[PDB]
Amino acid sequence: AQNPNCNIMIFHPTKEEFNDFDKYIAYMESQGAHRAGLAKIIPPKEWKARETYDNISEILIATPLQQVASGRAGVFTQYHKKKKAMTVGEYRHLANSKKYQTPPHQNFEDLERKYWKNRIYNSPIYGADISGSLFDENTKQWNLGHLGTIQDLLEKECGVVIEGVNTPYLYFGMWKTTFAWHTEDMDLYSINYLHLGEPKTWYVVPPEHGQRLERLARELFPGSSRGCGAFLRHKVALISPTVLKENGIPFNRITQEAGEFMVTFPYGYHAGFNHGFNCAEAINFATPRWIDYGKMASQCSCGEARVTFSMDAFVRILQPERYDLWKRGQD
Ligand SMILES: O=C(O)CNC(=O)C(=O)O
Ligand SMILES: [Mg+2]
Ligand code: NI
Ligand SMILES: [Zn+2]
């Protein structure tokens, strides 16, 4: 068995190997990359996502989200308070302000310490979940707006044609902006490209150990767990590496820098934070190996998770027994 300790693997594809996306994902899996839940892909030196980032300031962040924490430093939830619209240039200026900017630090480990010590005492503003792309249309390799769609994969594997679309999303971050512990919708893969700016630190639980994280989460967030049998689908709970280690939960960590891709694998729980002003692009995708994860994915039916249009068909076809209850939670 390849990668039996479930370490995060880092890949350096050549420009030739960068042509065929599906083939390279399958290659990484042949080397055991999925066992970690997360892999890093450093593009060949010949590649670029676009020519420059000099002309992005007029992108609108219609609903910036202020991420307000509750709990203790290592075990907290966050809620998202909607703020007034602002442009990316306005948001960049805000991120760099004295109130929001990254503090002085020695290295990534010192900043990580500061994040976990101090996160809860601040409410950073995240420009998350903005439909759009920053890849140039002429970038032919690993262009996250040009991937094979999940609807097409389901149709190719299972024979059933379904409605729905699959487009990317932009994330504008600042120091302390946080992504809570989650797996993807329908335990899909994700791919995330950090276009510019400061790093993003990731934590990940191997897919084979995901239920250990779920059991801890039920213990640590006991009201939430009574409310919903899949409350991590709400994407609000944070648990620090120190607390994970104290509770024996297997995990790994890695820092993504500008110009690097990360792939999350089916049922790989992940969480993390941004170091400072940045912009990432991410999308979900599927492969043949996903189908069995999709069929077994938990679902939130309490009403909280509310998701895209395109998840309806995935539930309907892969999980027909669950469909009626899940759709009620959508309505
Ligand atoms: O970058 C973020 O805020 C969150 N991203 C992801 O969870 C991902 O790419 O799967
Ligand atoms: Mg612009
Ligand atoms: Ni994710
Ligand atoms: Zn729920």
From Swiss-Prot:
Keywords: ADP-ribosylation, Chromatin regulator, Dioxygenase, Iron, Metal-binding, Nucleus, Oxidoreductase, Transcription, Transcription regulation, Ubl conjugation, Zinc. Zn(2+) binds at residues 228, 234, 300, 302. Its EC number is 1.14.11.66. Binds 1 Fe(2+) ion per subunit. GO terms for molecular function: chromatin DNA binding; damaged DNA binding; histone demethylase activity; histone H3K9 demethylase activity; histone H3K9me2/H3K9me3 demethylase activity; metal ion binding. Its main location: nucleus. Signal peptide: none annotated. Residues 8-50 form the JmjN domain. 2-oxoglutarate binds at residues 126, 192, 200, 235. GO terms for cellular component: blood microparticle; chromatin; nucleoplasm; nucleus; pericentric heterochromatin; site of double-strand break. Belongs to the JHDM3 histone demethylase family. This is Lysine-specific demethylase 4D. It comes from Homo sapiens. The chain holds residues 11 to 341 of 523 of the full protein.
